Structure formats: C-alpha cells, structure tokens
PDB file of C-alpha atoms in Angstrom:
ATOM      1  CA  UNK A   1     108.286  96.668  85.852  1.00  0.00           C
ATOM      2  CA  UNK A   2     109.207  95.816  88.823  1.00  0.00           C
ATOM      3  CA  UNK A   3     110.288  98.942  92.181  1.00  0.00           C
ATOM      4  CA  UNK A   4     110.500  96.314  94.643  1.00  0.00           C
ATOM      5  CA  UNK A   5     113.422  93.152  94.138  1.00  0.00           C
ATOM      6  CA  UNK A   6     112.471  89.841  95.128  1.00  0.00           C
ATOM      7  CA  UNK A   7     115.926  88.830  96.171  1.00  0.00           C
ATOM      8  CA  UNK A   8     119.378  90.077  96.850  1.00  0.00           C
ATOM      9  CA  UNK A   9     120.345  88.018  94.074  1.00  0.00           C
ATOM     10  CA  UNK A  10     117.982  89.931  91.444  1.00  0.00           C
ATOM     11  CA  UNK A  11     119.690  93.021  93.202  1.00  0.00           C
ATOM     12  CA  UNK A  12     123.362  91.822  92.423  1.00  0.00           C
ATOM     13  CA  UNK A  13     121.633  90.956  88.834  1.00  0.00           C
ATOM     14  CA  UNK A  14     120.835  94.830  88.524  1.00  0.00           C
ATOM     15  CA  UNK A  15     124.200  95.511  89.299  1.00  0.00           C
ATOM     16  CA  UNK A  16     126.031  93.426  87.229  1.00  0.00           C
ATOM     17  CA  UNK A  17     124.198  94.653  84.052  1.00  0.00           C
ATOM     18  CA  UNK A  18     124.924  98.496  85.307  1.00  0.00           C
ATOM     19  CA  UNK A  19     128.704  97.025  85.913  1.00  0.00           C
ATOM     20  CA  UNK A  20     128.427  95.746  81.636  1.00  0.00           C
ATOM     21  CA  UNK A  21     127.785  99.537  81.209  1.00  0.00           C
ATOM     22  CA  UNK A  22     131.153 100.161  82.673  1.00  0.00           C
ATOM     23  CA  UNK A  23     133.286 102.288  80.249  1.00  0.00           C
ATOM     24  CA  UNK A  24     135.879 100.350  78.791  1.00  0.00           C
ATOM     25  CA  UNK A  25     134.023  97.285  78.139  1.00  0.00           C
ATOM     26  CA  UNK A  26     132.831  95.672  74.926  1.00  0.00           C
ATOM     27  CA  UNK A  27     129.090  95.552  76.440  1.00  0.00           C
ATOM     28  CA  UNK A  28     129.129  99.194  77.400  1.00  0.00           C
ATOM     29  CA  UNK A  29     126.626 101.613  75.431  1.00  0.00           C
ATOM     30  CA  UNK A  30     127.882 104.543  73.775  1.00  0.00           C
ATOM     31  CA  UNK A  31     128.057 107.094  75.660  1.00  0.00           C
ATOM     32  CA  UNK A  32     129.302 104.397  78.295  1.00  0.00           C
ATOM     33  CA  UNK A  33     129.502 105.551  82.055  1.00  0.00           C
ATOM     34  CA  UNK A  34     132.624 107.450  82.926  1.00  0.00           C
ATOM     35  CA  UNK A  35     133.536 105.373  85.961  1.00  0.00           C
ATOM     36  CA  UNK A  36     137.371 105.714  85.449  1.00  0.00           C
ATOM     37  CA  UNK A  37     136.418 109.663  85.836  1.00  0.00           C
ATOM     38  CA  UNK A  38     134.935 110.143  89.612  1.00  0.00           C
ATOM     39  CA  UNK A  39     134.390 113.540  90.061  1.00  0.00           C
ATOM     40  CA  UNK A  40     131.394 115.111  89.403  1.00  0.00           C
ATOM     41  CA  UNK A  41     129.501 112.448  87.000  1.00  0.00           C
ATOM     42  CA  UNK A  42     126.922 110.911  89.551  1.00  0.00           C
ATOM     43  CA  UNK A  43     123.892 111.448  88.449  1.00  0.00           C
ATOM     44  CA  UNK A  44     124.708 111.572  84.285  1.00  0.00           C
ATOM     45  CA  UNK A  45     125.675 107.919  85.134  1.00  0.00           C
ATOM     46  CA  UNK A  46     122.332 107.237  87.197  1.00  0.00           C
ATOM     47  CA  UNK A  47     119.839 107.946  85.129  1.00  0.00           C
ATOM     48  CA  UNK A  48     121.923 105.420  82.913  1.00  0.00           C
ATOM     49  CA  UNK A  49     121.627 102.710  85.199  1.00  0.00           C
ATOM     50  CA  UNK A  50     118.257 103.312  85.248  1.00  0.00           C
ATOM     51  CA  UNK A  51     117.738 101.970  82.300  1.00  0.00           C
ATOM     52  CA  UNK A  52     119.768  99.083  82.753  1.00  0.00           C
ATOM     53  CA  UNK A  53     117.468  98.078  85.508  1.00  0.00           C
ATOM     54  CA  UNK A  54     114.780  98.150  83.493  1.00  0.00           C
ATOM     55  CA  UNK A  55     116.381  95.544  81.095  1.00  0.00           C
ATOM     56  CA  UNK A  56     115.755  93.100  83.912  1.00  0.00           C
ATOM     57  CA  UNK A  57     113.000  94.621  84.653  1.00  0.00           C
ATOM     58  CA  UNK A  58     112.812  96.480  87.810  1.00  0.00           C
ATOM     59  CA  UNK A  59     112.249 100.317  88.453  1.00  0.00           C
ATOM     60  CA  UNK A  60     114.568 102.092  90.534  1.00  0.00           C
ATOM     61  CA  UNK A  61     114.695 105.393  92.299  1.00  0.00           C
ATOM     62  CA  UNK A  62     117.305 108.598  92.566  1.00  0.00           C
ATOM     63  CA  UNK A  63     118.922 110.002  96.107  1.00  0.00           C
ATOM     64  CA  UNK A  64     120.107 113.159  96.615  1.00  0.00           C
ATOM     65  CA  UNK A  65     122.272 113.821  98.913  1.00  0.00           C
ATOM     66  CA  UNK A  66     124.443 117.288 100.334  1.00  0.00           C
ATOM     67  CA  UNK A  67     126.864 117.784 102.017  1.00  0.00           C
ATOM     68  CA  UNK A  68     130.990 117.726 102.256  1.00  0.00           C
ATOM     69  CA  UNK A  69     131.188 114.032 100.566  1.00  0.00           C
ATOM     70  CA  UNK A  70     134.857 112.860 100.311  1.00  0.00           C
ATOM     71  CA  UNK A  71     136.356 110.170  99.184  1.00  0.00           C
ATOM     72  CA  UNK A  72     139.594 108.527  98.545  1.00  0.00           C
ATOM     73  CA  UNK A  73     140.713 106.221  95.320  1.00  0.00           C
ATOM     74  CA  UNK A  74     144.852 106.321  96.274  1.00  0.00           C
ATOM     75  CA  UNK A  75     145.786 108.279  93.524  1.00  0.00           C
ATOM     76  CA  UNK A  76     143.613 110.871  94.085  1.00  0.00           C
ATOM     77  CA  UNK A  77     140.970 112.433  96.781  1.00  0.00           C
ATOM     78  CA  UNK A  78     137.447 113.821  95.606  1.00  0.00           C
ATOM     79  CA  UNK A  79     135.166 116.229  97.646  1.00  0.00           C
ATOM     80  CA  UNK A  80     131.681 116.990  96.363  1.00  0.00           C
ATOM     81  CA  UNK A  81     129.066 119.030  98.332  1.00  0.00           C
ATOM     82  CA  UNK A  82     126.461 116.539  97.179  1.00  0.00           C
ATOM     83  CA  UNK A  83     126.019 113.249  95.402  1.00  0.00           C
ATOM     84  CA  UNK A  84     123.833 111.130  93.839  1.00  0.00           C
ATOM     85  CA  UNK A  85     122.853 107.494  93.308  1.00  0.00           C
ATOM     86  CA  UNK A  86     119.611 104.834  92.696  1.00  0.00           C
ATOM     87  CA  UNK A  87     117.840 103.672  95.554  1.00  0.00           C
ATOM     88  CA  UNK A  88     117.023 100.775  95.031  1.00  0.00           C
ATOM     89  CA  UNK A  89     114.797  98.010  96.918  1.00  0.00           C
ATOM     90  CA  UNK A  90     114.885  94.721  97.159  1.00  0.00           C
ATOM     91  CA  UNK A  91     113.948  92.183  99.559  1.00  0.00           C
ATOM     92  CA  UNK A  92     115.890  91.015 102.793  1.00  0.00           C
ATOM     93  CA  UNK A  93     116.035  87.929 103.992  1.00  0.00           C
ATOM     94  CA  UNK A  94     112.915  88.273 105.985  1.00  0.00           C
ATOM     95  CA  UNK A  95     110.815  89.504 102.613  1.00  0.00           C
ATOM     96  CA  UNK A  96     111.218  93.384 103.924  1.00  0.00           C
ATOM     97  CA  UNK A  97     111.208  96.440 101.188  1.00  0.00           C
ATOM     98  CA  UNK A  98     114.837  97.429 101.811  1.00  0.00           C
ATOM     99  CA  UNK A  99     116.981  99.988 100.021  1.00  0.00           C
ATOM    100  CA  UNK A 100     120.048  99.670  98.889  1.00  0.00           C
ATOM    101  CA  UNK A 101     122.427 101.325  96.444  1.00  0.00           C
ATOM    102  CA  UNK A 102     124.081 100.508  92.995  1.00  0.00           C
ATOM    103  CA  UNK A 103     126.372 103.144  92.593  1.00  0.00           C
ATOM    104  CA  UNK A 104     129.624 101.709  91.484  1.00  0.00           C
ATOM    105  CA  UNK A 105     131.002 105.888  92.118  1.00  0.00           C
ATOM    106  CA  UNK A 106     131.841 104.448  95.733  1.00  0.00           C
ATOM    107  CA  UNK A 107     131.333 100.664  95.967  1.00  0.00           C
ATOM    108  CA  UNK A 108     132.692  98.661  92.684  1.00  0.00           C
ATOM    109  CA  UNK A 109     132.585  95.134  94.421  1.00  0.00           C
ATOM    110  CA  UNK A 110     128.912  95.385  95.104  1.00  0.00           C
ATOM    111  CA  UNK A 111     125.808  97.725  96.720  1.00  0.00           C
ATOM    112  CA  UNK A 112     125.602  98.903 100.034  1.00  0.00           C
ATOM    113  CA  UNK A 113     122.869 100.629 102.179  1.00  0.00           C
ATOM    114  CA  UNK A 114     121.872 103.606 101.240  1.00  0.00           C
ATOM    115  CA  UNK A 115     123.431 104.794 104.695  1.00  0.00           C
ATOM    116  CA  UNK A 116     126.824 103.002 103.653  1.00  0.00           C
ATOM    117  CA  UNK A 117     126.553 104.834 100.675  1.00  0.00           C
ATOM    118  CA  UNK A 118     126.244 108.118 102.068  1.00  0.00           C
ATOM    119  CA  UNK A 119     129.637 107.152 103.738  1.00  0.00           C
ATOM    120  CA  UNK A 120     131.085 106.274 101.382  1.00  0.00           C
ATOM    121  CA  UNK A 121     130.686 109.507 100.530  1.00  0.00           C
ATOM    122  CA  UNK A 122     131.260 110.700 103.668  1.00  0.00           C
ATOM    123  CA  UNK A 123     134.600 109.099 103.617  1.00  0.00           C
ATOM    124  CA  UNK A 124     136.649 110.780 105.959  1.00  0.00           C
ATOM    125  CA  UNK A 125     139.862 109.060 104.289  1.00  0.00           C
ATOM    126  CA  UNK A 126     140.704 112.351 102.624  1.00  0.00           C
ATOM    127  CA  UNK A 127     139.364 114.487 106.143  1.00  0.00           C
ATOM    128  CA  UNK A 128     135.599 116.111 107.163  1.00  0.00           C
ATOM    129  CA  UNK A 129     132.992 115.123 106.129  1.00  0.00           C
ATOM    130  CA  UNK A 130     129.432 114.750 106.893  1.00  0.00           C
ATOM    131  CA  UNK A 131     125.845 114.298 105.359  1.00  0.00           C
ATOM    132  CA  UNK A 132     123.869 117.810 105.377  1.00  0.00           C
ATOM    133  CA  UNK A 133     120.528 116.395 104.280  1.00  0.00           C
ATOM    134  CA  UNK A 134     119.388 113.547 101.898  1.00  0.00           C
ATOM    135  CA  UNK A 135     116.327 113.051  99.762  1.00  0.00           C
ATOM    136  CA  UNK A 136     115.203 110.149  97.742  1.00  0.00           C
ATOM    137  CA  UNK A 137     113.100 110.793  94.064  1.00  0.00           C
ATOM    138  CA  UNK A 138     111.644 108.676  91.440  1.00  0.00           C
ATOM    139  CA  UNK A 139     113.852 106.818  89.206  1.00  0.00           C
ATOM    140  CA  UNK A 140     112.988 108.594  85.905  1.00  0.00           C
ATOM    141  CA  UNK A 141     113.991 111.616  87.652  1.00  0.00           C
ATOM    142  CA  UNK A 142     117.379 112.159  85.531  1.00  0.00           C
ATOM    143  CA  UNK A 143     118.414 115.619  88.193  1.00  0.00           C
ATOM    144  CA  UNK A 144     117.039 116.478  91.162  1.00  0.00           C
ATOM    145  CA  UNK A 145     117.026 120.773  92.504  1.00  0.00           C
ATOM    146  CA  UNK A 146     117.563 121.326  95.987  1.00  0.00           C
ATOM    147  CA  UNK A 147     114.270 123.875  94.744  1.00  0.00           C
ATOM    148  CA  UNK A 148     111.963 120.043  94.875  1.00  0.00           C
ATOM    149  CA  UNK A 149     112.382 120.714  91.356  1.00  0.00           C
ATOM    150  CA  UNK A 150     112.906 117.183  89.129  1.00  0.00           C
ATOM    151  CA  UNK A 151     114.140 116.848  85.469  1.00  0.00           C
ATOM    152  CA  UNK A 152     113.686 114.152  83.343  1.00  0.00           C
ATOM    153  CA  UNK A 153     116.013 113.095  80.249  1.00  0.00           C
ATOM    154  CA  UNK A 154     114.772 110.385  77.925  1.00  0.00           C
ATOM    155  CA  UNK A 155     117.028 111.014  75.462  1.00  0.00           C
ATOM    156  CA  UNK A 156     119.482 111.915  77.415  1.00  0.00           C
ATOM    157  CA  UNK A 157     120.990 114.675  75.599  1.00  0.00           C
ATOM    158  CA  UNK A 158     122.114 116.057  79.114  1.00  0.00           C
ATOM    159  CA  UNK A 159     123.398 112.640  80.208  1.00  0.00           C
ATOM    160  CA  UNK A 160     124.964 111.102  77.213  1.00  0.00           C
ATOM    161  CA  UNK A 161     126.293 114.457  76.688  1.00  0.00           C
ATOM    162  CA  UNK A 162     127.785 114.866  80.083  1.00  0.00           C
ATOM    163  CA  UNK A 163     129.646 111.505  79.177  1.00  0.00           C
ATOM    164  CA  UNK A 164     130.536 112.019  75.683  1.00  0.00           C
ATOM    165  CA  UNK A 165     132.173 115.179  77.025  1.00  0.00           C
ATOM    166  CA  UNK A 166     133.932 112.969  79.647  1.00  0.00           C
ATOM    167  CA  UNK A 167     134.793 110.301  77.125  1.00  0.00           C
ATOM    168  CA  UNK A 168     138.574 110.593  77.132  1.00  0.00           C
ATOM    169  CA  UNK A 169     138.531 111.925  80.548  1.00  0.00           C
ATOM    170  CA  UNK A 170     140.329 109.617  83.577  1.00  0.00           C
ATOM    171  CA  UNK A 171     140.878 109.824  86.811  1.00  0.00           C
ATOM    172  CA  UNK A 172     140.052 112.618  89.153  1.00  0.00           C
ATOM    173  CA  UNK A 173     141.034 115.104  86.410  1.00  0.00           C
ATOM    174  CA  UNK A 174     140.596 117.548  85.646  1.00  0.00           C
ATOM    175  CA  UNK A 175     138.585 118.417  88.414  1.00  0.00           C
ATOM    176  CA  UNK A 176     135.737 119.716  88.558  1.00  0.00           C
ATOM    177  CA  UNK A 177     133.969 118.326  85.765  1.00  0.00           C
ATOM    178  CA  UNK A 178     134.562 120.958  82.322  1.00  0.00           C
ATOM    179  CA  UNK A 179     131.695 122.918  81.037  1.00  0.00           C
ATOM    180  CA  UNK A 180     129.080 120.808  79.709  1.00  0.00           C
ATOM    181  CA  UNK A 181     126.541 123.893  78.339  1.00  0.00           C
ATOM    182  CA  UNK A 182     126.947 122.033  74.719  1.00  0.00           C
ATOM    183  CA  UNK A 183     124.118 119.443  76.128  1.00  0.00           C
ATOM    184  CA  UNK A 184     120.310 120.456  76.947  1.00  0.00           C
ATOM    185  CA  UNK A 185     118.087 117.946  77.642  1.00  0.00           C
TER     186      UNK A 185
END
C-alpha cells in the first residue's frame, strides 16, 4: 500500500474512484455512499472510501473533528457538532508529505486541505461556527470516541448498515440521521 501519494494527480485518482462510489451511479457498490443525504453520514461513508483508496493502492487516514460545523447546500442548512473525513497525503509540488481531504460531504469538485475542510464545515453560510478540537486516526479506524477509543468495521455491518438504512433517504431529511441500532459491527 501506499500512506503517502506521489502526486496530486494520484490524489485526484483517489478521488475519482471514491466519486464512482457515489450513490446513484452504475459503478457504485451496494450499499453505495449516501451523498445525496448530508446529514449525519460522515464517517459510514469514510471508512468506504477507504477502501476505494486501497483499489489504487494507497492507505489513508480518518479526522475527527468537533465542534458547531455548518454548512449550506441551498435547499437546506446542516449543523453537526463534529465531522469526519480521510486525511489523506500526498505530495506537493516540492515532494512534501501534505494532507489533504477527499470528502465529497463538503467539496464535490475536488479535495481541499484538511484546514479547508474543517471550513467547510465551519461554514458560516448558515451562521456560527467554529472548530472545537480536531484529531487525525488511522485509516482502518471505521469510528473514532472522543474517549481515544477507535473501532474498526471490516465488514462493515455498522457502515453498510448505516447506508442501507439511508438508501432511499435524500436531502437533508429527515434530520438527524434515524435510528440505526439494527447494525453492530
């Protein structure tokens, strides 16, 4: 595998296989990534991504972040009091270990540093907002505790789950996300 990108343009790469996961395609796994759904779905999606990255062949990592994160999609504002998303690092244009994220949740057209990101979530669009605290985790980490506690979901029972239960679900409703107790990693 490969934590480290050699390029932006293996970065992009990463991306645009993640972007093939996107629900509504005829690419998309099953359970697909509910990405016409932002509202609590962040990390479900992740972990997914994940292993999209590793098709190419890189390893990425997981970012947890708190706080008031809004956001703004002009149908519809969404406030969570933490998000998550894959750090991921590739290589600038001077050959420097950079991060950068791939969380299409905020940024469809492409990644963004992971300071962007938290921005993004940040986004003041729909009022306050502001970062509380931010941690970064490996990549196989599927949920992150603010107890430094770290799950891990290879079959992703709790993932695919949290999806499959948010299959038919669009837009920012309903809001939050429904009970998901069904799954259990």
């Amino acid at each position: 595998l490969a934590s480290v990108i050699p390029d932006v343009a293996t970065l992009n790469s990463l991306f645009n296989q993640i972007k093939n996961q996107s629900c509504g395609t005829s690419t998309a796994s099953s359970p697909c990534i509910t990405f016409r759904y932002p509202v609590d779905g962040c990390y479900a999606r992740a972990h997914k991504m994940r292993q999209i990255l590793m098709n190419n062949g890189y390893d990425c990592e997981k970012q947890f972040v708190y706080g008031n994160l809004k956001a703004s999609t002009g149908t519809c504002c969404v406030a969570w009091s933490y998000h998550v998303a894959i750090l991921v690092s590739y290589k600038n244009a001077s050959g420097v270990t950079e991060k950068r994220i791939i969380d299409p949740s905020l940024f469809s057209s492409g990644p963004v540093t992971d300071t962007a990101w938290r921005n993004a979530c940040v986004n003041t669009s729909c009022g306050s907002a502001s970062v509380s605290s931010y941690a970064n985790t490996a990549g196989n980490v599927y949920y992150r505790s603010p107890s430094n506690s770290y799950l891990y979901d290879n079959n992703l029972i709790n993932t695919n789950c949290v999806l499959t239960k948010f299959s038919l679900l669009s837009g920012c409703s309903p809001s939050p996300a429904p009970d998901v107790s069904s799954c259990g990693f």
